Each structure stands twice: as structure tokens, then as C-alpha cells.
Amino acid sequence: FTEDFQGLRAEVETISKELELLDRELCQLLLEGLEGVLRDQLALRALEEALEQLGPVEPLDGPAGAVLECLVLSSGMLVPELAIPVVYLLGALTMLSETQHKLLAEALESQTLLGPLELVGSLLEQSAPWQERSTMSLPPGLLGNSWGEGAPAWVLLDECGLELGEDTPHVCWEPQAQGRMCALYASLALLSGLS
């Protein structure tokens, strides 16, 4: 496809559009599982090794088993119609730091995904092309009350590679933050579709 943000948006939403095969009951169970997985460095690696991008997977313990018990048949066989959307989510979580993983668990818990979901989305579309350093500035329409040092929307962008500012042009886009910003948007977009 395209290397733009609209080419990433179509790449991501094709994983969400057919994720409607997940029921409302399973969506909240997968959400309660991914919340505990994002709080454990070990459970995320244990879950990712179990999925492994044929054979039945053994049941796990803790939050890792909570997610895996939402994606297997009675015999333990992985359903490829639903396991691949999840392994695309984890493929976007390996590119994120553990600090961002915890702040996603706070967003999943207090129902605050839509806060920085569009903020990252608007920053990824106005920063085209990704190959150049550009001095941007978020509008007051995207938050502006939460903004500040140590804020959830601040730490999620600082851990990507962006040099943030409280005043002036608030955000400075660096091309090295491209990989983590696309993964941070993919994580927030897929989790919002599951919500």
C-alpha cells in the first residue's frame, strides 16, 4: 500500500473491520485480559511466544492465559480468523516501551482511549512527510488541559522519540520516531475497535 498515514489507517482498520467477528462478551474479556498483560513484562512475552504469529497451544496462567482462553477452540487449536488480529496488536506492542504499556493499561481501565488516539492520529497525518523534521503545534481542540510534564499524553509521545514543549510549537517531529508512532496509533486504534 502507501507509506503515508492513510495507507497505515487502511492497514489498521482492515484488522478492526473484520474483528467484528468477536462478540460483545468476548470483547470485554479480551479487554480485561490485555489490560493485565500490558501490566506484566513476562505475560506479554509468554503470550507472544504462545501465539507465534498449526498446533494447539497449551493453557497459560495469569493475564497471559486470560487472553489465550479467548482465542482457542475446545481442543486448544488457534482460530486463524481471530488470532492474527491479536498477533498484529502484539506486533505493535513489542515496538513500544514498558512505560507506554502501563499508560495504555491506565487508559483501558479508566475508559480514556479516545484522548490520545486522535492526538497521535492527527500528529501522524500533519507530520507528512515522515522523512523531515517539522515544527508542529497541537491545537487546543486536542486536549490542552491534560498537556504538561508527566502527563499521559506527554509520556506517550516523549517515549516515541519526540521532543515535546509546553509552550510555543509543542511538538517537534523527528523521523526516528516513525516506527513507534505508527505502532502507538495501531495499538490505540485496535484497542478502540475492541471497545
Binding site: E20, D23, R24, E25
Partner: protein, 167 residues
């Protein structure tokens, strides 16, 4: 009450004749059935349904005599009825129920059911399949394998629906 209740002699007779082809009825001592009635009476640009209150009382009494808790919402738009339907689709008491009844009473055209803000220029229509996929197994797993009776009182066109033939 007004419903001629089924005798236990006959209730046993029907379940004995075709047990594997009847939806299982839960016990009255612990079931929590639900029924939703959405009736739009007065409209902002369409003639008011004069006398639509007797239909609300009649259906509510009928559903209560069958063992259903009736929730009635009046005068809503196509988007306002969607908020009350999805809130009705993940109610907690549906997992301890065995059936449900949905009654829709408003104006309507060939497309679907009209809302409060419905006009000729700007529609306000809640189509039929919008109601169906909103309480399907996906958005409402608590009613999987359970009867979902939807009753619709609304016009569907403008023709009288008659034809004259030789007698």
C-alpha cells in the same frame, strides 16, 4: 390475567409431544424477562398519532400478564431509539431470561420506521435490519438461542392494498 393461562395438564401435554423442538422456558421463581416498547406519538412535521396511548396500555398489559417487565419510551428519533435499543441489548437480566418482546409503534415508509424529526426532505428512518443486527448474537450474546419477537406497528407505503374481483 386476561390471558387464558395454560393448564399444567396441557402444558405437560405440549412439552411431551415435541420436547426437542420447543424453546426452553425458565422457572418463574428466578427468570427476569424483559420487554421494550418504543412508541412515537407526536411529531414535529407529521400528523400526530391520536389514540396511540390505548395501544401502549394494551400491549404493556399483555406483556406483563405473560411475565415480562415492560419498558416504554415515547417520542424519540432514529438515533435516540438506537441509544435505548443498545442499552436494552446488554441489560444484565437478559442472561437470566428466556425470551424478549420488542414493540415499535410510529409512522413508517417502505424504508423503515420514522422518528420524531422525520420529514419529507430530511429523513429520520430506523431501517428494519438496523433493529435486527442490533440485537443479534454479536451485539447481544445474552439472547443467543433465545426467541426475539419483534412486533412493528407502522405504515409501509401509500397504496390502499385492495383489488376488486368478480363475485
Amino acid at each position: 390475567g386476561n390471558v387464558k393461562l395454560c393448564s399444567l395438564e396441557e402444558a405437560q401435554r405440549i412439552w411431551k409431544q415435541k420436547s426437542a423442538e420447543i424453546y426452553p422456558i425458565m422457572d418463574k421463581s428466578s427468570r427476569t424477562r424483559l420487554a421494550l416498547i418504543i412508541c412515537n406519538e407526536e411529531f414535529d412535521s407529521i400528523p400526530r398519532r391520536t389514540g396511540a396511548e390505548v395501544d401502549i396500555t394494551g400491549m404493556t398489559m399483555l406483556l406483563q400478564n405473560l411475565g415480562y417487565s415492560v419498558d416504554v419510551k415515547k417520542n424519540l428519533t432514529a438515533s435516540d431509539m438506537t441509544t435505548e435499543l443498545e442499552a436494552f441489548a446488554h441489560r444484565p437480566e437478559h442472561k437470566t431470561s428466556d425470551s424478549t418482546f420488542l414493540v415499535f409503534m410510529s409512522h413508517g415508509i417502505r424504508e423503515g420506521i420514522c422518528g420524531k424529526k422525520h420529514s419529507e426532505q430530511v429523513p429520520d428512518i430506523l431501517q428494519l435490519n438496523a433493529i435486527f443486527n442490533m440485537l443479534n448474537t454479536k451485539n447481544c450474546p445474552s439472547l443467543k438461542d433465545k426467541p426475539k419477537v419483534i412486533i412493528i406497528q407502522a405504515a409501509r407505503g401509500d397504496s390502499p392494498g385492495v383489488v376488486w374481483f368478480k363475485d
